[PDB]
Paper text:
CTX-M-15, which belongs to hydrolases (EC 3.5.2.6), cleaves lactam carbon–nitrogen amide bonds rapidly, deactivating β-lactam antibiotics. To understand the mechanism of CTX-M-15 activity, we have determined the crystal structures of CTX-M-15 in complex with two specific classes of beta-lactam compounds, desfuroylceftiofur (DFC) and ampicillin, and an inhibitor, clavulanic acid. The binding pocket of CTX-M-15 for those β-lactams was established by the residues from both the α- and α/β-domains, surrounded by the catalytic residues Ser70, Lys73, Ser130, and Glu166.
In its trans-enamine intermediate, the C2 atom of the lactam ring in ampicillin was covalently bonded to the hydroxyl sidechain of Ser70. The backbone amides of Ser70 and Ser237 generated the oxyanion hole that stabilized the position of the negatively charged carbonyl oxygen of the acyloxyl group in the acyl-enzyme intermediate. The carbonyl oxygen atom of the ampicillin amide group had a hydrogen bond interaction with the oxygen backbone of Ser130. The primary amine in ampicillin, which differentiates it from the parent compound, penicillin, was oriented parallelly with the sidechain of Tyr105. Two methyl groups of the penam ring of ampicillin showed hydrophobic interactions with the methyl sidechain of Thr235. The carboxyl group attached to the penam ring was within a hydrogen bond distance from the guanidium sidechain of Arg274.
Author numbering: 28 to 287
The structure:
Amino acid sequence: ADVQQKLAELERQSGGRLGVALINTADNSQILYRADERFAMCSTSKVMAAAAVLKKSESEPNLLNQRVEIKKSDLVNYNPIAEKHVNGTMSLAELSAAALQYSDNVAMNKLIAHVGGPASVTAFARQLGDETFRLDRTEPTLNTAIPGDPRDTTSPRAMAQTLRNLTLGKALGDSQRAQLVTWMKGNTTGAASIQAGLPASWVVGDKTGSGGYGTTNDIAVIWPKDRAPLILVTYFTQPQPKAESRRDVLASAAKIVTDG
Ligand SMILES: *C(=O)[C@H](NC(=O)[C@@H](N)c1ccccc1)[C@H]1N[C@@H](C(=O)O)C(C)(C)S1
C-alpha cells in the first residue's frame, strides 16, 4: 500500500500527471498508477514504428536493406543521424537504429512512410491486441502533448503489455525480436530516465520520449542480474506548456516501483 502512496506524492511534489505500468515477468505481477489514462507518447512511439517495419520484414526478406533517400527537405527539428546522409540514403535498418538509439525524427518519418502512414502503424498495434495505441501525426508535431488531446497517445498498461509482447513475447519472429532488443539496448538517450532509478549493474533497453507541456516519458525492458526481466513504462506530463523536462521523475518512479 506504500508503493502507491509513494508514487502519489512523487506526482504531487513533482506537480504533474504520472502514469506507470510495471510488469514483473517473474510472477507476472504488475504495478499500475493511472495505468489506464492516456498519455502523449512522444518519441516512445518510435518503438511501434520500428516494430511495424520489423514485422513487415518477416514477409519481405530483405526489407531492412531497402534504401531510403534523405532529402534536405526531409530534415526537421532533430536530425542527428539523417543530417549526415542528405542527398544520400539510409537503409530501413539504419533508420530504425537511428530512430530508436538517437531519437532521430527524420528516421521516424521514414519509418511511418514505409508502413503506410500513422493509421497503419496503429493498425499494426491492433494486430498485436493493443486497442489503445493510436498514432495520428508525423514528426515533429506528434509531440505536442496538449492536455486532453488524444492524438498520438496510449495508456501505460497497454504499452507495457505491448512492449512485453514485442521484446519478450512472440509478436515478432525470433530474429526481429532480437534485433529490436539490441537496438533498444543500444539507446544513447536514456541514461537519466528509467535507467537512473535502477542499480547501475542492471541492463536496460529503453526508448525515451519528450514533448510539449514538460512531457517526459520512457519505456524500457530491464534485465537485472540474476532476476527475471521487467517491463516498465513511465509517462509524465505537466500543466504549463513551457514546463521543462523532468527525466528525474521517471528515475524516481522507477526507483519506487523497483524497491524490493
Ligand atoms: C521523442 O520525443 C524525443 N525527442 C524528439 O522527438 C525531438 N523533437 C528531440 C530530441 C532530442 C532533442 C531535442 C528534440 C526523443 N529524443 C531524446 C534525446 O535525444 O534526448 C529525448 C530524451 C529528447 S527523447
